[PDB]
Amino acid sequence: NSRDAGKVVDSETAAICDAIFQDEETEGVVRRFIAEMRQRVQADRNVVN
Amino acid sequence: QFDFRASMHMLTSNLTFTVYSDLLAFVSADTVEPINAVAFDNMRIMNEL
Amino acid sequence: MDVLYSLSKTLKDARDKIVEGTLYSNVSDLIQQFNQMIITMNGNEFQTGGIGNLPIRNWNFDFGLLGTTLLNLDANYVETARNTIDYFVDFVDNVCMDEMVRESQRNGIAPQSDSLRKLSGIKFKRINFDNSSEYIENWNLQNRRQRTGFTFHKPNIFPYSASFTLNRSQPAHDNLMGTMWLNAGSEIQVAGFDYSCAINAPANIQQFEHIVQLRRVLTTATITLLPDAERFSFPRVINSADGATTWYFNPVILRPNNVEVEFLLNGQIINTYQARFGTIIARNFDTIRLSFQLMRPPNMTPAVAALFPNAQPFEHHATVGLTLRIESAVCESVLADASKTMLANVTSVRQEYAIPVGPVFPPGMNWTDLITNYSPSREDNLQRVFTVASIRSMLV
Numbered sequence: 001n002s003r004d005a006g007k008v009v010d011s012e013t014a015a016i017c018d019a020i021f022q023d024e025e026t027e028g029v030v031r032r033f034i035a036e037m038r039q040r041v042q043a044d045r046n047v048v049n
Numbered sequence: 050q051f052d053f054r055a056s057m058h059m060l061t062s063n064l065t066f067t068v069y070s071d072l073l074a075f076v077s078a079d080t081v082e083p084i085n086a087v088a089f090d091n092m093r094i095m096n097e098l
Numbered sequence: 099m100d101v102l103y104s105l106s107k108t109l110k111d112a113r114d115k116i117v118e119g120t121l122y123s124n125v126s127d128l129i130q131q132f133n134q135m136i137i138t139m140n141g142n143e144f145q146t147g148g149i150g151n152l153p154i155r156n157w158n159f160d161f162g163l164l165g166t167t168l169l170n171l172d173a174n175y176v177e178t179a180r181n182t183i184d185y186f187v188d189f190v191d192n193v194c195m196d197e198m199v200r201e202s203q204r205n206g207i208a209p210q211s212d213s214l215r216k217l218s219g220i221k222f223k224r225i226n227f228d229n230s231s232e233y234i235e236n237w238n239l240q241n242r243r244q245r246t247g248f249t250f251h252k253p254n255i256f257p258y259s260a261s262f263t264l265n266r267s268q269p270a271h272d273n274l275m276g277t278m279w280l281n282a283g284s285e286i287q288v289a290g291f292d293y294s295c296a297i298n299a300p301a302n303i304q305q306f307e308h309i310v311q312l313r314r315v316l317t318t319a320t321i322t323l324l325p326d327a328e329r330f331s332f333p334r335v336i337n338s339a340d341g342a343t344t345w346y347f348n349p350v351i352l353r354p355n356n357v358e359v360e361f362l363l364n365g366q367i368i369n370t371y372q373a374r375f376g377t378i379i380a381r382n383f384d385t386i387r388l389s390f391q392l393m394r395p396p397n398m399t400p401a402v403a404a405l406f407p408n409a410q411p412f413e414h415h416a417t418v419g420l421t422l423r424i425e426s427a428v429c430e431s432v433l434a435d436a437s438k439t440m441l442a443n444v445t446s447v448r449q450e451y452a453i454p455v456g457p458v459f460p461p462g463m464n465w466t467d468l469i470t471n472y473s474p475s476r477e478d479n480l481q482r483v484f485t486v487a488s489i490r491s492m493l494v
């Protein structure tokens with residue numbers, strides 16, 4: 001559901017996020033956040049979030 | 050109850066690294082000719098020759 | 099200037115909007131703008147100079163961008179943002195101070211400090227975003243040669259001047275006719291005095307005129323006109339014109355007669371108010387002409403008749419007055435005024451660091467000297483420093 005090529009850890013998180021995204025009772029804010037939450041990979045710093 | 054705000058976290062780690070077990074494999078070790086081997090007193094171990 | 103203002107506005111928005119618990123959607127565009135500013139400023143070395151006692155300061159920029167990671171912002175995010183914002187605010191304040199303390203005769207509107215000249219480069223134009231403040235909007239419109247104005251409450255448009263003119267005088271200063279006036283800030287208190295109470299006037303009428311040439315054109319001005327000038331309605335001992343001696347003034351206030359307040363632009367009669375007191379509107383003017391008459395009362399009660407004899411000595415001197423207060427106005431040029439703090443800020447910065455007197459502004463940023471000789475070069479420099487001060491005020 002990411003609109004910016006997002007990634008998540010782990011596959012179980014992906015399943016949970018998809019289930020929440022498809023849910024009808026989910027808040028619009030939560031849905032948009034799932035669509036927009038991003039990882040940050042800093043190879044120069046050797047860090048990943 | 051499942052709360053998205055309480056369950057969404059950012060997990061941080063290193064992008065990559067290689068773990069080594071045999072440190073001494075990184076050391077090139079050679080030895081002098083046995084004839085020339087000396088003891089703690091800087092004299093040859095066997096001096097009768 | 100627009101880049102400096104954009105830095106200041108970005109930092110102010112970051113400080114106000116990046117708060118604990120705020121939704122990610124309340125700062126998304128702000129986070130984008132802040133990251134753009136961080137990217138633009140990263141890897142640049144700035145030097146705020148050492149004019150006067152202002153210390154020489156070196157600024158380096160190596161800051162990480164702000165993530166978009168939590169649905170509601172937490173304390174860690176706010177702490178990181180606060181660290182970056184604090185450093186950037188220090189840099190911006192120092193750049194503003196460095197710019198405020200300089201001036202140029204030829205290019206007074208252009209940047210003077212090295213820091214702002216560097217910020218005027220193309221690479222920094224990316225930092226630019228919404229320019230919504232009054233002073234920055236006026237800066238941009240003026241750069242585009244578009245008509246625009248600053249709105250002032252009690253504009254400081256009249257240089258301080260407390261003086262008099264004696265149209266009739268003697269060495270003994272006992273039968274005097276003339277005018278006194280105080281012009282201070284937005285106030286003009288004028289009075290016309292006749293010691294003889296117009297006993298020998300052509301029609302028992304003495305005509306007094308006060309002309310004030312404003313140094314800049316004021317538009318859409320609201321003015322309060324009051325019949326009497328309370329500053330010149332009590333007995334005074336006044337030094338002679340040359341200071342040789344002193345003379346005595348013992349006013350008795352009479353109603354001003356045939357009052358006419360004329361607001362002139364280009365010598366043309368823009369506005370005219372005849373025997374009208376209270377709130378009046380001057381559309382657009384650069385000169386004020388207050389012409390009023392002292393009329394000897396044709397009918398006097400015995401006490402009043404006792405006040406004014408037919409000949410000398412005159413112990414009671416008939417005075418008429420006028421008070422004019424520009425409560426608010428609009429001017430195409432920057433001015434000091436009661437509400438704003440730009441003159442105070444620039445003067446305080448220049449005093450606190452002992453900036454030597456420059457070639458443009460008067461010593462100590464004396465506002466009376468500045469407005470008295472408000473040259474185009476001084477106007478340009480004053481607009482520059484006032485805009486920088488307004489930029490600084492957003493963060494300091």
Ligand SMILES: [Cl-]
Nearest residue numbers: 251252425436
């Ligand atoms: Cl006021």
Ligand SMILES: [Zn+2]
Nearest residue numbers: 251252436437
């Ligand atoms: Zn006020």
Ligand SMILES: [Zn+2]
Nearest residue numbers: 267271338339
């Ligand atoms: Zn005199």
